[PDB]
Ligand binder design. Structure first.
Ligand SMILES: [Ca+2]
Ligand SMILES: [Ca+2]
Ligand SMILES: [Ca+2]
Ligand SMILES: [Ca+2]
Ligand SMILES: [Ca+2]
Ligand SMILES: [Ca+2]
Length: 453
């Protein structure tokens, strides 16, 4: 005879796609091909063989015996590496004068197995290695903080259900994490009390997963990628009131009292942050007490307080009311109702209470540093030094030096919240002489004494 027919392919059937499991042993059987060459004799016996596809190297994954046609694995088959492997089979007759060949396409597709487990994916180094959620403080029960996420099981389908659970770190049980990944608030939280919480969440496919018995291996966020740190930070609300530094403030005013003079600066604190911390001040009423009297004479608005400055300022000349003092009731309020009260005592200082500080610089320059000098001095003296005026120096003899400057001041004892006799202030200066001796010279000071008899 002569090779007259080409082989034909009984199995595998035309354009078929075999499905096997993944990660099966090497050289594990897959399929047994069969083809028929009608020709009798060797011209019609078939010999099976894959084809070294040009770009497709998939054939490297299997072996097929030349006679038996049995297809066996040759490499590992991880669906996770490649899913469909595609091959072109070839059946040749042994016939002569030339053998004939027949090519049948085939494809192998792997079925997924629970090969892997749900795993997290860390963020870039340095960058925060955790996940942040935010929720308003004093939030109510149930308020969704937010949705944990960040895991994935390489697997497909049911082999990759990913449920989240809290592994450790809510010992106080402020939240609950429904497996879906929703974090719910359970308790009152107060930024001012605790600000950030944190804990470790587990990702497992086990809807019944329960934390290990507590003394077990402590966890390692650096190795276990089934774990992620989650940090909840509390947003702020206006839940804190303004709180005055003191509840009696005392400062002195001079009869000679340039209108608009800054007497003292109060302050109030709102623990709150941002707008909620904005504090606005003001004056509730003013009482005038003439020398010794138990009638609070109630003269006009004689003072002003900056709504934001907190600096009480003169509004009249007090040369009129020489004997006596004032009680100013003040208020501080936040953007939203929280309020606090206090009391300022302004006392018209007697000469007996007022001191001068001579300085060998032009008065202009003395104003240049007045604040600094006083701040330093008050610190070192540990007492409130309040600058009252800056004028040119006058010798007791009545000489006036147009390069020497005076600095009338009055002092209060933080401790007694009470004003000071010149006497006691001189003594204080002398006591601290040594500590102070540095300041005075650094600032061209020349002497100290009261309002000229
Ligand atoms: Ca043939
Ligand atoms: Ca796998
Ligand atoms: Ca798998
Ligand atoms: Ca899995
Ligand atoms: Ca707050
Ligand atoms: Ca507030």
């Amino acid at each position: 005879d002569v090779n007259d027919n080409r082989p034909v392919f009984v199995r595998p059937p035309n354009g078929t796609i075999l499905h096997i499991k993944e990660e099966i042993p090497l050289r594990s059987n897959v399929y047994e091909v069969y083809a028929t060459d009608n020709d009798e004799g060797l011209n019609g016996a078939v010999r099976y063989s894959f084809l070294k596809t040009t770009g497709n190297r998939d054939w490297e994954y299997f072996t097929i015996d030349p006679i038996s046609g049995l297809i066996q694995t040759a490499q590992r088959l991880d669906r996770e590496k490649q899913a469909v492997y595609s091959l072109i089979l070839v059946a040749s007759d042994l016939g002569q004068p030339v053998p004939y060949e027949t090519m049948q396409p085939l494809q192998v597709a792997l079925e997924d197995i629970d090969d892997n487990e749900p795993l997290f994916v860390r963020p870039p180094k340095g960058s925060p290695q955790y996940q942040l959620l935010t929720v308003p403080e004093h939030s109510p029960r149930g308020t969704l903080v937010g949705n944990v996420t960040g895991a994935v099981d390489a697997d497909e389908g049911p082999n990759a259900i990913v449920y989240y659970f809290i592994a450790a770190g809510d010992e106080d049980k402020n939240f609950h994490l429904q497996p879906d990944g929703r974090l719910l608030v359970l308790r009152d939280l107060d930024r001012e009390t605790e600000a950030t919480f944190s804990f470790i969440v587990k990702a497992s496919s086990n809807r019944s997963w329960t934390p290990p018995r507590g003394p077990s291996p402590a966890l390692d966020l650096l190795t276990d990628l089934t774990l992620q740190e989650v940090r909840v930070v509390l947003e702020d609300i206006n839940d804190q009131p303004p709180r005055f530094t003191k509840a009696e403030y005392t400062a002195g005013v001079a009869t000679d009292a340039k209108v608009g003079s800054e007497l003292i600066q109060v302050l109030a604190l709102d623990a709150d942050i941002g707008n909620n911390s904005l504090v606005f001040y003001g004056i509730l009423a003013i009482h005038y007490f003439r020398a010794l009297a138990n009638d609070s004479e109630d003269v006009g608005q004689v003072f002003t307080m900056g709504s934001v400055d907190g600096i009480l300022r003169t509004a009249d000349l007090f040369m009129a009311y020489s004997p006596g003092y004032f009680v100013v009731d003040i208020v501080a309020r936040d953007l939203a109702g929280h309020n606090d009260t206090a009391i300022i005592g302004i006392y018209i200082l007697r000469d007996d209470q007022r001191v001068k500080i001579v300085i060998n610089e032009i008065p202009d320059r003395v104003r240049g540093f007045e604040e600094e000098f006083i701040r330093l001095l008050s610190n070192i003296t540990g007492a409130i030094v309040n600058t009252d005026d800056v004028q040119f120096h006058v010798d007791m003899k009545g000489r006036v030096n147009f390069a020497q400057t005076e600095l009338l001041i009055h002092v209060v004892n933080r401790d007694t919240n009470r004003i000071l006799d010149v006497d006691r202030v001189i003594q204080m200066i002398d006591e601290n002489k040594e500590q102070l001796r540095n300041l005075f010279r650094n600032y061209n000071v020349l002497d100290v004494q009261p309002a000229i008899s």
